[PDB]
């Protein structure tokens, strides 16, 4: 699953979280088995 978020939002990409992204865009289940991989893409701007 792949997308671009602001760096401060990356904390929300974890199982059982709350916040705008975790509520209204992309929610992980409480028993999630997997890896979340993220990096700054600031050079694209």
């Amino acid at each position: 699953d792949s997308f671009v978020i602001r760096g401060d939002e990356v904390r929300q990409i974890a199982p059982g979280q709350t916040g705008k992204i975790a509520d209204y865009n992309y929610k992980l289940p409480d028993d999630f088995t997997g890896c979340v991989i993220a990096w700054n893409s600031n050079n694209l701007d």
């Binding site: 974890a14 059982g16 979280q17 709350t18 409480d30």
Partner: protein, 49 residues
């Protein structure tokens, strides 16, 4: 005091049940013993712990 054996059995049943109910108030290291506090004070991951 003649019926001490039977009154002791009634007392021990009441003492055991009162102890079992009083233990609902104990924290066991949890942030509150009122379960609805935990479910309203915290996010789901911390609440489950």
């Amino acid at each position: 005091s003649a019926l001490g054996k039977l009154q002791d059995v009634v007392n021990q049943n009441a003492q055991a049940l009162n102890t079992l109910v009083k233990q609902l108030s104990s924290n066991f290291g949890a942030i509150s013993s009122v379960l609805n506090d935990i479910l309203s004070r915290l996010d789901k991951v911390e609440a489950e712990v």
